[PDB]
mmCIF file of C-alpha atoms in Angstrom:
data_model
loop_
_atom_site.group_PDB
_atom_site.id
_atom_site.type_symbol
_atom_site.label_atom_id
_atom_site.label_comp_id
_atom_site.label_asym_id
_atom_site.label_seq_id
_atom_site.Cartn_x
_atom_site.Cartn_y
_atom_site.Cartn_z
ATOM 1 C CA UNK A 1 -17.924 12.908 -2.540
ATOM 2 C CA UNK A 2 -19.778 14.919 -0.010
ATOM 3 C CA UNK A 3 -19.978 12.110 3.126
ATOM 4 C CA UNK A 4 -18.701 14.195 6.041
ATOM 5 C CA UNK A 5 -15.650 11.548 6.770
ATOM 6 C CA UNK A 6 -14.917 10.508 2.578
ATOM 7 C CA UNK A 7 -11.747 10.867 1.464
ATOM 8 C CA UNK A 8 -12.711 10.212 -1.633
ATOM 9 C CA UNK A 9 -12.945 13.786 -2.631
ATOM 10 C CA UNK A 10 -9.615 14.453 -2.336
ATOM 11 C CA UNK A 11 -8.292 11.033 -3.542
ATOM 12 C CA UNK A 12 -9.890 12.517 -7.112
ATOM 13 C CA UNK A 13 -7.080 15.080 -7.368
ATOM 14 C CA UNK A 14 -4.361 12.488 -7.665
ATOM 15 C CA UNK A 15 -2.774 13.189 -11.209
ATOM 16 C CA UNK A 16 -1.744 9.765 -12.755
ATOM 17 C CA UNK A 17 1.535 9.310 -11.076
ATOM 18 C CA UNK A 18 0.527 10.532 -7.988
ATOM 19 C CA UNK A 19 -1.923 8.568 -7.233
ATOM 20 C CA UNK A 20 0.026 5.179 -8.039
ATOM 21 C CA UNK A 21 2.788 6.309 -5.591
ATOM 22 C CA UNK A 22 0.390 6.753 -3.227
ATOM 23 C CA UNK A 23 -0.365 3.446 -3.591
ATOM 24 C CA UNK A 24 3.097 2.453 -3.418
ATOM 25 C CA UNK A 25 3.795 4.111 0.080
ATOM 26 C CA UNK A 26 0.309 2.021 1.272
ATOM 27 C CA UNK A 27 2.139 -0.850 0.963
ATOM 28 C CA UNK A 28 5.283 -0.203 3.050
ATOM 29 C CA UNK A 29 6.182 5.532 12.115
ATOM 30 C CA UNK A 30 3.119 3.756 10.458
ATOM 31 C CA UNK A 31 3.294 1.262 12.563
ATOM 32 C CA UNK A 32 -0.362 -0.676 11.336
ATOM 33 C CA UNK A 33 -0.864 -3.427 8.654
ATOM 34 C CA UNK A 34 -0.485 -1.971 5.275
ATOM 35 C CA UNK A 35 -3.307 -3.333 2.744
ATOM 36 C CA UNK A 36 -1.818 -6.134 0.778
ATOM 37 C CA UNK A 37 -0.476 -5.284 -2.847
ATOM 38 C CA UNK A 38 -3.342 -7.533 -4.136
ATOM 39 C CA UNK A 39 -5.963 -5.084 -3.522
ATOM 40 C CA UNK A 40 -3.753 -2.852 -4.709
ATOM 41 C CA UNK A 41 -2.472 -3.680 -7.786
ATOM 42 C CA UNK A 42 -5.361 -2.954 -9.638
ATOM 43 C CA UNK A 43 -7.098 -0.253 -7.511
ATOM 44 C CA UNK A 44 -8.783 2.642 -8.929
ATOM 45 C CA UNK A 45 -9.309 5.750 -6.781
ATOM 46 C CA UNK A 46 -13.160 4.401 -5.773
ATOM 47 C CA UNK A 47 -11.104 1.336 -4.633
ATOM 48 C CA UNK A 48 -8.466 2.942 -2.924
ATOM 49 C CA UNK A 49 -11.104 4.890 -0.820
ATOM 50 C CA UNK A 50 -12.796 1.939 0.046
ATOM 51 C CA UNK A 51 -9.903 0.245 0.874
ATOM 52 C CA UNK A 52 -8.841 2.473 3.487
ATOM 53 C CA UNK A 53 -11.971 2.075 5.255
ATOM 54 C CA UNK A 54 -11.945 -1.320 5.239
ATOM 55 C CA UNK A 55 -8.361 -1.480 6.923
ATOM 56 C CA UNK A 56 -8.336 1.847 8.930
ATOM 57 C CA UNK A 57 -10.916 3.302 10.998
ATOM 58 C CA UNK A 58 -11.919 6.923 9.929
ATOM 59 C CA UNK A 59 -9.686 8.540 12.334
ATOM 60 C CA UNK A 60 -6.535 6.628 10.961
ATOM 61 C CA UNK A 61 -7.207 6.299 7.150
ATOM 62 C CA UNK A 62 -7.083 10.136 7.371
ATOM 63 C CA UNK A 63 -4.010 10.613 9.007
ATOM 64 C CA UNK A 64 -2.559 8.206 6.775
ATOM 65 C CA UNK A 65 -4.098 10.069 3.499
ATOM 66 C CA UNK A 66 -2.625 13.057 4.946
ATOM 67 C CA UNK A 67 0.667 12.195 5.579
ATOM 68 C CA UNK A 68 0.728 10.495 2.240
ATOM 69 C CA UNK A 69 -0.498 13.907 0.539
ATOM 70 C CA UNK A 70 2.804 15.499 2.055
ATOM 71 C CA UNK A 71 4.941 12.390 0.550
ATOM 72 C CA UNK A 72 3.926 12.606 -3.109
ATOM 73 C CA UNK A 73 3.996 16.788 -3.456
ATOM 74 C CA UNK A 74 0.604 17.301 -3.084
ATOM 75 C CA UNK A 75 0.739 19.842 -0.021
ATOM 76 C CA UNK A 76 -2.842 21.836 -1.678
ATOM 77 C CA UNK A 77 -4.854 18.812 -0.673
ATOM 78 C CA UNK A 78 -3.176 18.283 2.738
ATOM 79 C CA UNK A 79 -4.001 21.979 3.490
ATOM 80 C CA UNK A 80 -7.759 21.695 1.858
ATOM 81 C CA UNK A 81 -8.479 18.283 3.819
ATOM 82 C CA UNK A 82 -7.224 19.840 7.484
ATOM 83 C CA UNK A 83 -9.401 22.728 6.544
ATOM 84 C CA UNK A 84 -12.007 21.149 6.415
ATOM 85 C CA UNK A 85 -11.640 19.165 9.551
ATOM 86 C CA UNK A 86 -10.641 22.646 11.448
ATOM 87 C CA UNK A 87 -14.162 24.182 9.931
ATOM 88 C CA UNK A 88 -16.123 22.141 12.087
ATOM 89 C CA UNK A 89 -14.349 23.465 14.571
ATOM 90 C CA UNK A 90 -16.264 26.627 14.154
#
């Protein structure tokens, strides 16, 4: 939860719904590979997290995490997550 590029500590926050359309929009500019709907199908959030490291570099599975935070009404995690990225700023 606390590894200084996981994702997984936001992923957690997905209610239910949210977190399968989020997987939904992983499968569809985003112009990469998305991870096959295999993986997906049955992916909890642990799996999820791991599969966006496996496909996309750190740099990339955040942006896409992100930008999928903004797609599924979940704009408190997209503002949480960039915070903590503009902290170490400081």
């Amino acid at each position: 939860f606390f590894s200084d590029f996981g994702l997984l500590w936001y992923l957690k926050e997905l209610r239910k719904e949210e977190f399968w359309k989020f997987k939904e929009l992983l499968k569809q500019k985003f112009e990469l590979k998305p991870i096959p709907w295999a993986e997906l199908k049955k992916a909890s959030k642990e799996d999820v997290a791991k599969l966006l490291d496996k496909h996309y570099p750190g740099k990339q599975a955040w942006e896409v995490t992100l930008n999928l935070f903004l797609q599924i009404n979940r704009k408190d995690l997209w503002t949480k997550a960039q915070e903590e990225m503009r902290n170490k700023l400081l």
